[PDB]
Amino acid sequence: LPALKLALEYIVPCMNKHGICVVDDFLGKETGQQIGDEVRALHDTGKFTDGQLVSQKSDSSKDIRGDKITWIEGKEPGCETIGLLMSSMDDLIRHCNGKLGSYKINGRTKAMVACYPGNGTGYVRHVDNPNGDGRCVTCIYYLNKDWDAKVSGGILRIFPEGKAQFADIEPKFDRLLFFWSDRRNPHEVQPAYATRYAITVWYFDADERARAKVKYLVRVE
Ligand SMILES: C[C@H](NC(=O)c1nc(Cl)c2ccccc2c1O)C(=O)O
Ligand SMILES: [Fe+2]
Numbered sequence: 001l002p003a004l005k006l007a008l009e010y011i012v013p014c015m016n017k018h019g020i021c022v023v024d025d026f027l028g029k030e031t032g033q034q035i036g037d038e039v040r041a042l043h044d045t046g047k048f049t050d051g052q053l054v055s056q057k058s059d060s061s062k063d064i065r066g067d068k069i070t071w072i073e074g075k076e077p078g079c080e081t082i083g084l085l086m087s088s089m090d091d092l093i094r095h096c097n098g099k100l101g102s103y104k105i106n107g108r109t110k111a112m113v114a115c116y117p118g119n120g121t122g123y124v125r126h127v128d129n130p131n132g133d134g135r136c137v138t139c140i141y142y143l144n145k146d147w148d149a150k151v152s153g154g155i156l157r158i159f160p161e162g163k164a165q166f167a168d169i170e171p172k173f174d175r176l177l178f179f180w181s182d183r184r185n186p187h188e189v190q191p192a193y194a195t196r197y198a199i200t201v202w203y204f205d206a207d208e209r210a211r212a213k214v215k216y217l218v219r220v221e
Pocket of ligand 1: 067069114123126127128140155156171187188189198
């Protein structure tokens with residue numbers, strides 16, 4: 001799909017109605033696999049952090065750590081396909097501007113590449129931007145081939161506001177997900193029992209970000 005067709009025929013109407021939108025087979029197998037290879041290279045060469053401290057025990061030798069991250073600009077050697085993903089995300093958002101709510105997106109974060117190492121850790125229920133920091137849309141790309149949650153866990157569970165039933169999303173290879181970053185979309189990552197990779201960028205609303213600068217006295221493109 002041309003980015004503009006995906007944007008106009010799906011992302012815009014989907015976001016305005018549900019605020020959570022899934023695009024499968026975003027970039028295709030070849031490109032997805034090359035992204036996977038770049039992320040695994042980052043992992044194998046020690047570019048991720050050691051992981052979120054989950055359980056801090058009296059003895060530090062068996063401390064439990066969870067999600068590992070690394071921040072990627074997209075131009076680094078060995079990260080050019082990641083950069084290409086980011087550009088593709090940006091192109092989609094561009095074609096959506098003026099149509100995602102009343103927001104006006106004028107920048108984004110660098111990419112946060114996350115690895116849940118497969119040791120039964122997940123991520124607690126949270127809101128990405130609960131305090132008005134400028135971020136209006138979360139965009140995440142999943143890289144996990146033949147991921148089977150029945151077996152490997154790692155489901156994203158989102159709980160929209162005032163709705164009784166949550167939504168479970170598998171972190172499937174070449175899946176792109178958009179959702180509003182604010183309190184409309186509390187979510188969590190259920191425990192993962194296999195290595196689980198994803199890449200997130202957050203898009204900023206111009207007005208919210210401009211006045212966040214005041215109240216809190218890292219944005220590109
Ligand atoms: C979408 C979900 N991930 C998150 O909700 C998620 N959210 C935040 Cl705010 C994270 C922050 C630091 C490191 C990993 C994070 C993280 O992973 C997922 O991976 O499916
Ligand atoms: Fe999150």
